[PDB]
Amino acid sequence: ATIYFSSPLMPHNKKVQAVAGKRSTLLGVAQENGVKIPFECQDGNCGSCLVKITHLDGERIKGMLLTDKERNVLKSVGKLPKSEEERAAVRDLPPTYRLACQTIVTDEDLLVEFTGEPGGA
Amino acid sequence: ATIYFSSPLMPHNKKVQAVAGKRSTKKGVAQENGVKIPFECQDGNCGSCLVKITHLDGERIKGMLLTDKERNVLKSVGKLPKSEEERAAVRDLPPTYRLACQTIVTDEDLLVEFTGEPGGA
Amino acid sequence: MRQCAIYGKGGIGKSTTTQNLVAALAEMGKKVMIVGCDPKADSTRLILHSKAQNTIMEMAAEAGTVEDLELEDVLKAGYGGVKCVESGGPEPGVGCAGRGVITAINFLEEEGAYEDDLDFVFYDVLGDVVCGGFAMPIRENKAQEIYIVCSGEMMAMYAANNISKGIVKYANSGSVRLGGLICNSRNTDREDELIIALANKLGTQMIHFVPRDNVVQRAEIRRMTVIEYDPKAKQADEYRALARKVVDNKLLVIPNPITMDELEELLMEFGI
Amino acid sequence: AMRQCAIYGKGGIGKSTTTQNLVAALAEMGKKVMIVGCDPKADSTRLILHSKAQNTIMEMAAEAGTVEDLELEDVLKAGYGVKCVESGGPEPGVGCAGRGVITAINFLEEEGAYEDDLDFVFYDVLGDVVCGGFAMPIRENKAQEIYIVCSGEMMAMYAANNISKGIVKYANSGSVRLGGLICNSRNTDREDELIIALANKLGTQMIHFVPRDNVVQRAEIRRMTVIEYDPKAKQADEYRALARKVVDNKLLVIPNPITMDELEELLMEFGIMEVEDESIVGK
Amino acid sequence: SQQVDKIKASYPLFLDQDYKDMLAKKRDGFEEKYPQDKIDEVFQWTTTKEYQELNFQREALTVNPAKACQPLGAVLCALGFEKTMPYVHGSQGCVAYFRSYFNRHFREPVSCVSDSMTEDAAVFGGQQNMKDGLQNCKATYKPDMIAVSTTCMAEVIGDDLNAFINNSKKEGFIPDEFPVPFAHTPSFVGSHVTGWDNMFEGIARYFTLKSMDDKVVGSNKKINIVPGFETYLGNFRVIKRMLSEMGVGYSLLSDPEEVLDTPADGQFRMYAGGTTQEEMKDAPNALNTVLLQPWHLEKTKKFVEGTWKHEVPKLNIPMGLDWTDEFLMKVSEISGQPIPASLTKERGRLVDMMTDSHTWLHGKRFALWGDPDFVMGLVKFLLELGCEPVHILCHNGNKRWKKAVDAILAASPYGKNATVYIGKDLWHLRSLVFTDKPDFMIGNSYGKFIQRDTLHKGKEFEVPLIRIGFPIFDRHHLHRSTTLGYEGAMQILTTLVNSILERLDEETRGMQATDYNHDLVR
Amino acid sequence: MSREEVESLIQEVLEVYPEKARKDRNKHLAVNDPAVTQSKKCIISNKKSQPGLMTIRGCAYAGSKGVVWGPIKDMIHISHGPVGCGQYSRAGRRNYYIGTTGVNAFVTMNFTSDFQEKDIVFGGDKKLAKLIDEVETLFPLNKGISVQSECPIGLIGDDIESVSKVKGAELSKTIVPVRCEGFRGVSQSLGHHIANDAVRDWVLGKRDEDTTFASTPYDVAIIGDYNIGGDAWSSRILLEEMGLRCVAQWSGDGSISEIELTPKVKLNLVHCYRSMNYISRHMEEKYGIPWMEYNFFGPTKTIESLRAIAAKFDESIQKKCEEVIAKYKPEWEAVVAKYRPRLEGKRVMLYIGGLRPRHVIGAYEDLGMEVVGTGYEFAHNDDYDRTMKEMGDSTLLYDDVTGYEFEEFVKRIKPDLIGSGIKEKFIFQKMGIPFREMHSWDYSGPYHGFDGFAIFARDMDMTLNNPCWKKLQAPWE
Ligand SMILES: Nc1ncnc2c1ncn2[C@@H]1O[C@H](COP(=O)(O)OP(=O)(O)O)[C@@H](O)[C@H]1O
Ligand SMILES: Nc1ncnc2c1ncn2[C@@H]1O[C@H](COP(=O)(O)OP(=O)(O)O)[C@@H](O)[C@H]1O
Ligand code: ICS
C-alpha cells in the first residue's frame, strides 16, 4: 500500500509504503513517518485526527466497515453528509472524511490531506 | 511514471502508467487512456486544457522549463500567481496549474485534476 | 477615480448608450476612458470614427505575445479626449470567450494606464452570461459601480436578475454595488412603470429612461456620437440628463434576487 | 541555554503588558529574549517595537502567496534588543482561530529562528479557550514552563483551572509543567490572598502580585514598556522583581485541577461570592 | 606552497610531497578504489587476444569513435562561400559544439548561428524559429547568403525547411530574392563528410537548376573543382598553385581558406574571400567538374552528372606519386594545356626524396585511421614508399570503399599483412596495436591515449603517434600543412622518416647501454 | 563611472536589431548600481535566446553530461543517441582525476550508442539493454553506469527509466537515467538541475540504512568544485591544513563512494552555487546538513572564506585556521609585490557563464585591476543579486550577450584584457586585445587557493604584458 500525505504544514508531500490491514491504524503509519496529524485522545471520540482521504486508484476501492463510533464522531464534527452515510450503510463504501486513529490501511494508493487543525474547524 | 487522473465527470479516479519525456505531452497520455480533457486548439494558445498538477512524491520533483508561450496563456486565464511565476523563473519549478497539451511527463507520481471546463472558468 | 461597468443582454443598446454617456461626460471636461469588454468590437466605433478598432487580442496574436504589445498601439484617443480600449475574444469554440477581458484588464494595470488622473472608467461588458472574464470585473473588484441596461422583455429582465445574483455572491469580498437600472425603450406601452417596479423590487433606484428614435441611427452612418453630431437634439440632452444623474448618484444598494414566478407575475400584471 | 516559556490567561487581563515588561526587564540583565505573539489580536509586540502593530505571519504569507517564500528577516523584528514575531489569525468565522499559532511555530522552526541563540523564548497565548492552535504549544512540547496570569475574577480562575487541565493531560508525554501563577491587581481587596489559595489548591506557587498602576497607561499611549519609560518607578521594580523570580524559578509541578464546586466554595470563602443556602431558593 | 621565482602549474605542482600525501589520504579513506594488484591484472587482461575477441563481438556499444555528425560538415561547406552565414535549424547546443570543435583545430574564429529550438518547438515545430532567426541574422550580421542545415532534433520532428523558408519570404521576414539554400543533414545517417556532400548539393541545386536550359558545357572554358571536407589549409593552396602553374582556368567551389586564415591586424574580419554566387551560377558552363574526394562526394556526383551534363572523370584523391600523376594528366587532357617543366621538376624532387630515405622507411608497420578518401590516399602512398600498412581503420567507410582498398593492397607485395576495418572505433584499434604491434600510428589527436596505454604495458610495447588528420588539438598550426600533390607528399614523407629517426634516437640515448648506435649521421 | 555614456552606448548598439529582438535584448543590459539588492528591477536573466543572434549558450546535455556527471571517474557515462554529442564533448573540459583510464577510470573516454536511422525508427531501448551488457563484459571494474540522453531520445519516445530499473536489478549495479535532452531548457543551467535530480533520485539515498562509516565532528564535503586544472586539490589542502577532513568532492576527482558518503557529513561547502544549490538544499532538508558558499579566488577572498568556515566549528579549528593564514601570508604577499606593479590600474571585461564572473572579481582587485564589465551566459536572477555589490558603480552588466553586442561593447570601452571562452578568444585577438581563457584557464592553473593565486598572477601578466600586442600594425601602415 502506498500512502501520500499532504498538508499545508508540510513543505513537500510525503510518500510512504505501508502494510495493509495492520492493528495499528493510519495513525500508526503517520507517527512512524513523522507526519504530524494531531492526536488528542485514546478512545476515538475527540475527532481531532480528521483527514480527507482520496482513493487514487478508483478501480481498486475496497469495501470496509464504518463503525458506529467513527460515524457518530464524523456527525459531531459535521464531516458526514447524509448521502455518504447511506452509501456506507448500503454499499460499505468509505466516506471522504475519516478519523486517522480509526482508519485501517487497505491495499491501494491513498492521498491523505489534513490541515493541522482538529476536526470541527 | 504513474499518473492519477481526477475529475468530477469521471466516476472513479483513473491510474495510468506513462513513459516520461515523450514528445507527445500529457495530452497524449490522456487521449490514449480516454480521459476527456478539453483540447480545442493545435497551437497551444487557448486555455482549454488547463489542469491542476499535484506532485505526490514531494521529494522527487523534477526541474523543468516553463515555456514563454505556456506562461502567457496561464496568465491570460488568471492561473499564474506572481510568486509562482518568480519560482519558475528562478528555481525552474513547475507551477500548480499547467496546460496539458504543453506538459511533458516526468519520472514521478502525479495527480491531475480538471473540471471539464476550459481554462478561465 | 470611479470605476463603472455597463452590463446587459446583447442587443438592447448597451454600446450606444455608453458611447453617448461618456460623450456627454467629456463635454463637462471630464477625462473618461472606455474599455470594451464585448467580443463584438463595435463598442467604441462611434467615438473614434472607425470601421473596427483593432482589438488587443488580435494585436497580441499578430505581434507574437502580449509582452511585445505597446500601450500606444492599443490606447487611442477620440473626441473629447476619451481613452479608448477594445478587447476582443477568441474565435468561436476556441477556449473561454472571456479570456480577452482578463488579458486586457491585466495589461492596462501593468502599463499603468489608469493612474493618469482619469476620472471615469467604463467597462462595456457582455451580460448574456456571467462567467469567465465577463464576470471578472465583479470577481476581482475591478468595477465598483454597476449599471444594468434593460428593457421590458423577459430576456432583458432575466439578464438583470442574473447580474444581481452575481453581485450578491461577491458583495462580501469587495465593494461592488448595483447602481441603477438604465432603461431603454422599444416603444412598448407601460414600460417606464414596469422597469421601475422591477427596480424597487431590487431596492435600487432606476437611473433614467431612454426612449427610441431615429436620431441615433442617422449618427450611426456618420460613426459620430449623437452628442457630438447635434448637441441641440431631444435625445442629445436626454443623455446629458442620464450622465448628470450618474455622476451625482450617491446611493448604492446590494440587490436581492427575484424568483422566476415573481418576475413572471411582474411581467403578466403589466398586461404582457 | 534556552528556557522556552509561555504565558496563558483570559482575554483582557494584561498578558501582553506584563509579558512585554518582564521581557524588557530581562534584556537589562543581558538576556536575549524572543517574543512570539500567539494571540489573534496581534498586539503583543507593540510596546517593544514602538509600532502601530507588527505585521503577522498570516498577513505576509497571504500577501506573498505562501509561507515558503517568507523571509525570516521580514518576519522577525528586533526592538530593544529582543526579537519579536506575531502569529496573527485567520478571518473570524472561517478555519480555526488558533491556526496562526500552528503556522507560525512551524515556520519559525523550519527557518531557524528557534535555534539556541536566545536565552529565553516567550509565547503570549490566548487562554480563553483550550483548543487546536492555542493548546498546540502544550501538545507539541514547545513551551516547557507555563505561567498563568489570573485575577480575582470568577472567569480568570476558571480559565486558570482549564489551562492546568490541559497541562496534566500532556504531562506523561512531555516536559510541559506549570511554573507559577501571576496575579494582576483587579483593585480587589482579598484577591492577592484569593490567588495564593488557588495556587495551593492547584499545587503551584504565586510567582508575584502585580499592582494596578496608572503609570502603565502613560507608557501604553507611548507604545513603550514601563521599565524604559520610567526606570526609577516602583512599577518597573515589580516587573524587575517578577523577572528575577521567573529566572530563579525551579518549582515546575504537574498541577491538580479542582472542580467547579471547589472553585465556587473558594470564591465564597474570601467574600467575593456571598454564602449561598438551599432553603432560600424559591422566592 | 609556491616559490615566487619558480611558479609551478598543475604539473609538477601536484607532485610535491604534501599533495602526494593528500591524494593518498583521499583515495584510501573514502574512494574504496580497487586494489592496485587487481587494477594491474585487469589492465593486462585488456592487452590480450581473448579481450580482442570479446572486443570485436560488439554491436550496441561504440567506444572512442572516429567520426563526427553531419551538420559539422555542413557548416564547413557553407563557410566556403562568400559572405555566407552557416545556419543550423535546431537546438543551440549543436552550434556551440560545432564552433568550439573548429575553434580548437583551426585556432580561428568560426561564425555560425542557431534558431535555438526548445520544448515549445519540440511540441509545435520550429517554423517561428526559422522566421525570426532568418530576419535576426540578416539584420545583425548582414550576410549575402544564408545556408541552412539541420540538427537531429529537427530531423526527428519532421521540420521541412522548404515550406518554412518559403513562408518566411512570403510573410516579409526576408526579401524574396535573398538566397537561402538548405539541406537536410541527419546526424544518425553517415558522418560529418556526408553533411558536407548534402550541403554542397543543396547550394549547387539552389542556383544552377532553374537556369539549366540556358547553360552549355565548356563555354567559360574552366574546370570546376570540388574539394570536399578539407581541414588542411595547404590542401586548398596547393590545388590553386598547380592549376595556375599549368595555365588552366579553374573555379574552386566552397573554398574556405581565406576565412580560416585571416590576418591579425587590429581588425576582426567576420567574412573573407569565399566563392562568389556568380561562379556558382556559371558552374554548369565549365568543361568538366573534378571531385577531389569522390568517396564522400557521391550525392554531388549524381547532381553534376545528371543536371549539369558534365562527364565527371573517375579520379582518386591526388595523394602520393601515382595519383598525383593521374590527376595532372586528366586535367591536361580536359583543358588542353601541357604539364609545364615546373611540375616535372617538383615530381622529380619527390622521387629524389623517396630514394634518399627509402632505407629508413622499408618494412615499417603502420596503423592508420581517418576519413575514407584520406585513408585510401595514405595507404597508397605508404605502399609506394615500401612501408607496410597493417591496421587500416575507417569508422565511416562502407563495403564498396573497403573493397577498393583491398584491391589496392592486392596489387602490391607490401599489403600482405594489411587488413581493412569498417565500422570499428578506436577502442578496437587499441586492441589491434596490442596483439599485433605496429611501429607507429597515423591519425588524429585522439590516438594520444592509445600511445599512453601502450607505454603503461612497457617501453618496448609503446606505439608512438604521428599526427595527420582531423582534428589535431594538442599541437599548434599543423592545420597549415599540405597532404595533396607532390608538395603534400614531401611533407608527409619528411614527417614519416623524421618520426622514425626521432624514435631511434630516443631508444639509443642510454649511456653505456644502447648509445653505441647513437649515430651522428643517419 | 560615467553611467550616462554607458546608457547611451547600450542604445546605439541595439539599433541594428529588429523591433522584436531590440525589445528583448534591452532587458538583458544594465548599468551596475551597487546599492540595489534585488536585480530583478535592473536586469532579466534565464530567458530563451533570440534565434539567429550567435548566442554563446550550450544545451542541457552539456550542463549535465559535460559539467556534473562527466568528472565522476569510476562511473561509465553513456551518450545515448547519435555520435556527434559525445565526440565534441570528449576531454574538452579539463577535470583532474587520479586513475587508470580504461580500467577503473573512464573520464576521457566517449561511450555512445551511435544511433542510426533504424534506431530512430525502430525503438532504441533494445540497443540500450544490449549496450549495458557489453559494458559489463569489457569494463568489469566500473562502479556504475549513467545514461545521458541526447535530443532524439525524448523525441522518438524511449523508456530509459525501465531499462535502468530492469538492468540495474539484474546486474546488481546502479544505472542512472538522465533526461538531459538538449532542447530541454534554454542553456546549460537546466542541465545542472536535471543532473542534480538524478543524483538525488538514484544515488544519494543508497547508504541510508548503513551506519558503518566512522564520522568525526569535523567532517566536511566539497560541493560544486570540478577540479579544473586541479582546482579542487588546491582548495582541499587548505581545508585539511585547517584541521577539517573532507569525505566528498563534487564532482572533480569524484567517486561514486564519496557521493554516497556525503549525507554523513557535518557541513556542506558549496563553491558553485549555480550548479549544485539544488542538491545542497535537498541535503539540508532531508539530512539536516547545513551548507554555505565560500570563495577561494585570490588571497582576500580565501582568508575571508577560511575564517568563515572555521567559525562553524570549535576553537581548535579557528586556531588552526590562524596557522594556515600565517603560514601562507608571506607567499601571496611576495606574489603581489612582484606582479601588482605591472598590472595596476588596468581594466578587464569578463564574460563567463554562472559562477566565475562574480567569483574572480576579488582576485583581480588583489592585483590592482578593475573589472569594467561582468556578464553571464546562463546565470539566474539570484546570481545577479550576488554580483551587483561586487561590481563597481556605473559598470556594464550584460546577460546572454550576443556575438554582435560583445564586439561593440569592447571597441567602445577598450579594456586592457578580456576573460571569456574559446568561442570569443580568437575574435578579440585579431582585434589586438589580450585575452585569457576563463573556463579552461588557457590550459594552465589551478587558480584556487594560495597556490593558484601565484599561477593566476603570472598568467595575467604573461598575456597582458606580452610583446606581441605591440606589433598588430605594420610599420608602413
Ligand atoms: N437610444 C436609442 N434609440 C434608438 N435606437 C437605438 C438606441 N440605442 C441603440 N439603438 C439601436 O439598437 C442597437 C443596439 O446595438 P448596440 O448598442 O450597437 O450594441 P449592443 O448589442 O452592445 O447594445 C443598435 O443597432 C442601435 O441602432
Ligand atoms: N500592570 C498594569 N496596571 C494597570 N493596567 C494594566 C496593567 N497591565 C495591563 N493593564 C491594562 O489592561 C488592559 C488590557 O491589557 P492587555 O495586556 O491588552 O490584555 P491581554 O492579556 O488581553 O493582552 C490594557 O488597556 C492596559 O492598559
Ligand atoms: S559548474 Fe558551471 S561555464 Fe559552476 S556550467 Fe560552466 S567548471 Fe563556467 S563559470 Mo565553463 S557555473 Fe563550473 C562553470 Fe561555472 S563549464 Fe565551468 S567554467 S563554476
Ligand code: CLF
Ligand atoms: S542540443 Fe545538446 S549537443 Fe546538440 S544534438 Fe542536442 S543534446 Fe546534442 Fe550531437 S548529434 Fe550532432 S551535435 Fe547536435 S546535430 Fe544531432
Ligand code: SF4
Ligand atoms: S465561463 Fe462563460 S465564457 Fe467562459 S467558456 Fe464557460 S460559458 Fe464560455
Ligand code: SF4
Ligand atoms: S479548536 Fe478551538 S480555536 Fe480551533 S476552531 Fe475549535 S474552538 Fe476554535
Ligand code: FES
Ligand atoms: S485521536 Fe481522537 S478521535 Fe482520533
Ligand code: FES
Ligand atoms: S488544447 Fe489549447 S492550449 Fe492545450
Ligand SMILES: [Fe+3]
Ligand atoms: Fe589563429
Ligand SMILES: [Mg+2]
Ligand atoms: Mg455592441
Ligand SMILES: [Mg+2]
Ligand atoms: Mg493581548
